[PDB]
């Protein structure tokens, strides 16, 4: 029972994603180059990657049906708190179970100033999400639902946010019933929501370690202005 509106929403989110996610990595050439030899020698490259990814996430967010109805303040609140989660989510598309320059591993992320306190559960997240083998329709709906979360700190019009998210969540639940055949569909929605819960935890830890990194001006120096504005300064 996929309504015409729901199909519209899926069409919109797929296109919005195709316009903000380039799997060819063409733009990665414009980043400060990665350095593998190395104390924080990957920070410049990954910082640029995150800054870029935030720009792309913002472009995706604005194309979310209903999102434009929120106040700029509430749009800001949602993007500031979700940015890191949506980047972790969208990264899964490139995350491989098996250019080698732009193929990142544990030691790469470590050379950006992060520890296994984050990295381990991040890989666990990426492996578990990958196993769900989502349809791209489900992939883009999950990212949108993540962005439009009523419970983000600093949200004023929580009822509006919730109503937008509900439209999206109802669209996800219905899509899975009608389009995703079993066994692959078993509890799929509940598992997709669990991932959002996993992302809160990853968000939490990244914020802590980012605070340790960005405390030394020498490291803060290696970040970008957008990353400083969104993640904090």
């Amino acid at each position: 029972k996929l309504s015409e509106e729901q199909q519209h929403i899926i069409a919109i989110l797929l296109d919005a994603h195709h316009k903000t996610y380039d799997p060819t990595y063409a733009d990665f050439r414009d980043f400060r180059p990665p350095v593998r030899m190395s104390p924080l020698s990957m920070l410049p490259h990954l910082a640029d990657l995150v800054s870029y990814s935030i720009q792309k996430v913002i472009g995706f967010a604005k194309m979310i049906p209903g999102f434009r109805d929120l106040t700029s303040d509430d749009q800001i609140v949602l993007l500031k708190s979700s940015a890191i989660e949506v980047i972790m989510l969208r990264s899964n598309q490139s995350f491989t179970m098996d250019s080698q320059d732009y193929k990142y591993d544990v030691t790469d992320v470590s050379k950006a100033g992060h520890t296994l306190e984050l990295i381990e559960p991040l890989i666990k997240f990426q492996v578990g999400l990958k196993k769900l083998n989502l349809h791209e329709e489900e992939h883009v709906l999950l990212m949108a639902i993540c962005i439009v979360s009523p419970d983000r700190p600093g949200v004023q019009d929580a009822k509006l946010v919730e109503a937008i998210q509900d439209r999206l969540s109802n669209t996800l639940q219905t899509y899975i019933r009608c389009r995703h055949p079993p066994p692959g569909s078993h509890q799929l929605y509940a598992k997709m929501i669990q991932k959002l819960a996993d992302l809160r935890s990853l968000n939490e830890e990244h914020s802590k370690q980012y605070r340790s990194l960005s405390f030394q001006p020498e490291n803060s120096m290696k970040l970008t202005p957008l990353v400083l504005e969104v993640f904090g300064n």
Binding site: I58, A61, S72, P225, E229
Partner: peptide
């Protein structure tokens, strides 16, 4: 505090 860049990107 204020988010000039984030604001500008959200049009």
């Amino acid at each position: 505090k204020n988010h000039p860049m984030l604001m500008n990107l959200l049009k």
